[PDB]
């Protein structure tokens, strides 16, 4: 399954502007779940809208989410200057979430106009490891009740996009792993130290990259809340 948005968009503040994210299938459909989420500069990921059509509490009104015409659209009334960013939606695909590539919204004109964090995720910004090695990534979850919520692990670098990684949920116990990283990866988490665990083994070049973890859970705002992404660099 291959999901398609538009590369850019361009738009100028007061505008409305709609991004569009559609499916290799030929239609988002309601289990799709689609989330929708925001990147702006040094990789700062926030979640827009989860379970296609929810705005996450906290969110400004100008952002709405629905499925319309076999696509996810996200729309926003009265685009503002802070609103240049990256804009990715995410599919459930039954047993994994696949990413779009990313709308580019440049917002050009006049700035000024426009309406105006409990949840924290804190990750280390950096780790370097050899190759043949294992690497531990941490998260530590605060300002909510940490095991009630699952966190997912996310992966990116220019040119391959964002990739899911898995999933932990320290309630159940369950973990569900991409096909790419079930071998590479393993997840765990420490109730205690309300900290989740991403383990990296056999390491090799292509492991340099940015490794995210964010918030989950089961019929709500999926990838509403981020961590910073540590930045692992694999040495020579
Ligand atoms: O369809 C609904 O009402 C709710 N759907 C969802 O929340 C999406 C979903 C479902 C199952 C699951 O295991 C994962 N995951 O991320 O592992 C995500």
């Known amino acids: 399954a291959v999901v398609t948005q538009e590369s850019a968009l361009t738009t100028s503040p007061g505008e409305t502007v709609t991004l569009t994210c559609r499916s290799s299938?030929?239609?988002?459909?309601?289990?799709?779940?689609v989330s929708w989420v925001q990147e702006k500069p040094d990789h700062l990921f926030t979640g827009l809208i989860g379970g296609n059509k929810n705005r996450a509490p906290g969110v400004p009104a100008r952002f709405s989410g629905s499925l319309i015409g076999d696509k996810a659209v996200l729309t926003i009334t009265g685009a503002q200057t802070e609103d240049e960013a990256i804009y990715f939606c995410a599919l459930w695909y039954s047993n994994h979430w696949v990413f779009g590539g990313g709308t580019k919204l440049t917002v050009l004109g006049q700035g000024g106009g426009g309406s105006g964090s409990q949840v924290q995720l804190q990750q280390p910004g950096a780790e370097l490891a050899k190759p043949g090695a294992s690497v531990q990534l941490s998260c530590k979850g605060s300002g909510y009740t940490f095991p009630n919520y699952w966190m997912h692990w996310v992966t990116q670098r220019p040119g391959r996009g964002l990739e899911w990684i898995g999933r932990?949920?320290?309630?159940?116990?369950?973990?569900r792993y991409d096909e790419r990283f079930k071998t590479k990866a393993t997840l765990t988490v420490d109730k205690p130290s309300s900290t989740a665990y991403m383990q990296l083994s056999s390491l090799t070049s292509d492991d340099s990259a940015v490794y995210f973890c964010?918030?989950?859970?089961?019929?709500?705002?999926?990838?509403?809340?981020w961590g910073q992404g540590t930045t692992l660099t694999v040495s020579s």
């Open positions: 964010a918030r989950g859970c089961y019929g709500c705002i999926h990838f509403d809340y």
């Open positions: 932990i949920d320290p309630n159940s116990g369950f973990i």
């Open positions: 299938t030929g239609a988002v459909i309601s289990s799709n779940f």
